[PDB]
Design an enzyme around this catalytic site. Structure first.
Site, PDB file in Angstrom:
ATOM      1  N   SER A 146     -29.254 -41.349   0.186  1.00 42.44           N
ATOM      2  CA  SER A 146     -28.844 -40.570  -1.009  1.00 42.44           C
ATOM      3  C   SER A 146     -29.941 -39.477  -1.268  1.00 42.44           C
ATOM      4  O   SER A 146     -29.981 -38.595  -0.542  1.00 42.44           O
ATOM      5  CB  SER A 146     -28.932 -41.629  -2.266  1.00 42.44           C
ATOM      6  OG  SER A 146     -27.841 -42.618  -1.881  1.00 42.44           O
ATOM      7  N   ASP A 245     -17.805 -39.347  -0.054  1.00 41.36           N
ATOM      8  CA  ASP A 245     -19.050 -39.895  -0.650  1.00 41.36           C
ATOM      9  C   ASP A 245     -18.724 -39.882  -2.294  1.00 41.36           C
ATOM     10  O   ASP A 245     -18.163 -38.982  -2.806  1.00 41.36           O
ATOM     11  CB  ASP A 245     -20.296 -38.814  -0.396  1.00 41.36           C
ATOM     12  CG  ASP A 245     -21.310 -39.564  -0.888  1.00 41.36           C
ATOM     13  OD1 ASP A 245     -21.916 -40.394  -0.359  1.00 41.36           O
ATOM     14  OD2 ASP A 245     -21.820 -39.115  -1.747  1.00 41.36           O
ATOM     15  N   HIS A 291     -20.920 -44.813  -0.431  1.00 39.00           N
ATOM     16  CA  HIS A 291     -22.226 -43.944  -0.664  1.00 39.00           C
ATOM     17  C   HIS A 291     -23.404 -44.928  -0.050  1.00 39.00           C
ATOM     18  O   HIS A 291     -23.474 -46.145  -0.257  1.00 39.00           O
ATOM     19  CB  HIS A 291     -22.618 -44.110  -2.005  1.00 39.00           C
ATOM     20  CG  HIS A 291     -23.686 -42.937  -2.446  1.00 39.00           C
ATOM     21  ND1 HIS A 291     -23.740 -41.798  -1.929  1.00 39.00           N
ATOM     22  CD2 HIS A 291     -24.851 -43.139  -3.296  1.00 39.00           C
ATOM     23  CE1 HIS A 291     -24.832 -41.161  -2.331  1.00 39.00           C
ATOM     24  NE2 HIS A 291     -25.373 -41.886  -3.285  1.00 39.00           N
TER      25      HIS A 291
HETATM   26  O1  LIG Z   1     -27.561 -39.910  -3.503  1.00 44.04           O
HETATM   27  C1  LIG Z   1     -28.299 -40.124  -5.001  1.00 44.04           C
HETATM   28  O2  LIG Z   1     -29.405 -40.447  -5.068  1.00 44.04           O
HETATM   29  C2  LIG Z   1     -27.261 -39.815  -5.873  1.00 44.04           C
HETATM   30  C3  LIG Z   1     -26.654 -38.286  -6.048  1.00 44.04           C
HETATM   31  C4  LIG Z   1     -27.550 -37.120  -5.474  1.00 44.04           C
HETATM   32  O3  LIG Z   1     -28.813 -37.312  -5.498  1.00 44.04           O
HETATM   33  N1  LIG Z   1     -27.007 -35.842  -5.415  1.00 44.04           N
HETATM   34  C5  LIG Z   1     -25.446 -35.637  -5.634  1.00 44.04           C
HETATM   35  C6  LIG Z   1     -25.417 -33.998  -5.566  1.00 44.04           C
HETATM   36  C7  LIG Z   1     -26.687 -33.822  -5.071  1.00 44.04           C
HETATM   37  C8  LIG Z   1     -27.104 -32.173  -4.588  1.00 44.04           C
HETATM   38  C9  LIG Z   1     -28.188 -31.919  -4.133  1.00 44.04           C
HETATM   39  C10 LIG Z   1     -29.219 -33.038  -4.016  1.00 44.04           C
HETATM   40  C11 LIG Z   1     -28.824 -34.166  -4.587  1.00 44.04           C
HETATM   41  C12 LIG Z   1     -27.740 -34.582  -4.995  1.00 44.04           C
END
Ligand SMILES: O=C(O)CCC(=O)N1CCc2ccccc21
Ligand SMILES: *[C@@H]1O[C@H](CO)[C@@H](O)[C@H](O)[C@H]1NC(C)=O
Length: 346
Positions: A146, A245, A291
């Site tokens: 994530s 995702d 995810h």
């Molecule tokens: O996976 C996670 O913890 C939650 C989502 C996340 O972290 N997102 C989603 C969109 C994004 C763009 C750049 C960097 C990170 C993230």
């Protein structure tokens, strides 16, 4: 409860609220493999949304309530039954308590309600582990899921540079980025690019040097998007990403009878994701709506073209010793709809 907590001895390297950051460690005497895993869990980017996160997601902002142990699961399991890939490695779980996608380099101060020290937490964990056996390592795999997967992309080359300068050029640093490869695409209804642009200023966020030099001042948010930062990296990086995702769909304002516009949107997302992985030689991208994968206990179950992720990672290790007979490392589904792969998580 096999990984043991160590709070950082350098107590100026802190979680958001100024409490010490730390890591959980399970040593494996005689193994020269080290797995450092970065937890995920979104981010916050201003006072108001960080305050809300502090109320109801406090373990992601503070070490005050961390337990003394954690059980290693999935790729962090020490049982070969659960972890065919690296069960005998030295295991490190680095809790995400900086809310900055592991990019921050700012302390709590007169001017800052919160500290955003993700990039410094990784450096300090590495430095303290060197005295606990990491000095003898042959491979350091920086993994994460994530926001921790994006954190791998943002930090793997800095870990390599850190070890080189500290005098350990024989430690091979590699990255494993799980569920952190996002697209700055059009939303289904009308976002991360803006949230990240604000976050970088709020966090004093840092990005890899070559990517920074390409995009330059005010545009470093681009380096949080895997398909843009990956080509700038020198360390080998294996990319794991579900084609559909759930976090990507969330930031695209999709929530799941699907009509034509949404069907085309979802199919185009999978095609775009697949396209960005065409030239990523070590990748595992199943056509599932899900995810994260690597620290799930049943992470061995999913397969692409008949190959599981633990197998693909093993083949990657072999490739880093011409392609290998029956031991592939580039595994991207081509079917166009969630769960067209029968092995997708239920
Ligand atoms: O996976 C996670 O913890 C939650 C989502 C996340 O972290 N997102 C989603 C969109 C994004 C763009 C750049 C960097 C990170 C993230
Ligand atoms: C503690 O960490 C800070 C921030 O990364 C660094 O500037 C400092 O040199 C470190 N101090 C020690 C004694 O390791």
């Amino acid at each position: 409860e096999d990984l043991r907590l160590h709070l950082l001895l350098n107590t100026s390297v802190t979680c958001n609220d100024g409490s010490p950051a730390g890591y959980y460690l399970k040593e494996s005497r005689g193994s020269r493999r080290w797995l450092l895993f970065l937890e995920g869990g979104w981010y916050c980017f201003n006072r108001e949304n960080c305050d809300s996160r502090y109320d109801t997601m406090r373990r992601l902002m503070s070490s005050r309530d961390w337990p003394r142990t954690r059980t290693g699961t999935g790729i962090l399991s020490s049982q070969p039954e659960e972890n065919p890939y690296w069960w005998n490695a030295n295991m490190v779980f680095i809790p995400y308590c900086s809310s900055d996608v592991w990019s921050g380099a700012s302390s709590k101060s007169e001017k800052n309600e919160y500290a955003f020290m993700g990039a410094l937490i990784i450096q300090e964990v590495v430095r303290e582990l060197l005295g606990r056996g990491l000095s003898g390592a042959k491979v350091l795999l920086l993994a994460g899921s994530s926001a921790g997967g994006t954190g791998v992309l943002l930090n793997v080359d800095r870990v390599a540079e850190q070890l080189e300068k500290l005098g350990y050029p024989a430690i091979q640093v590699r990255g494993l980025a799980d569920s952190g490869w996002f697209l700055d695409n059009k939303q289904y209804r009308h976002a991360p690019t803006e949230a990240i642009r604000r976050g970088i200023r709020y966090w004093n966020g840092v990005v890899p040097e070559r990517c920074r030099r390409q995009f330059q001042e005010g545009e470093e948010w681009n380096c949080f998007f895997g398909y843009k930062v990956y080509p700038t990296l020198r360390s080998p990086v294996f990319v794991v990403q579900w084609l559909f995702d759930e976090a990507q769909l969330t930031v695209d304002n999709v929530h799941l009878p699907v009509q034509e516009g949404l069907r085309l949107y979802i199919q185009n997302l999978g095609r775009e994701l697949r396209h960005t992985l065409k030239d990523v030689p070590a990748s595992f991208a199943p056509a599932c709506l899900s995810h994260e994968i690597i620290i799930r206990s049943h992470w061995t179950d999913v397969q692409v073209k008949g190959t599981s992720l633990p197998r693909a990672l093993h083949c990657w290790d072999r490739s880093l010793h011409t392609p290998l007979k029956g031991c592939p490392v580039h595994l991207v589904d081509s079917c166009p709809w969630p769960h067209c792969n029968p092995s997708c998580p239920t």
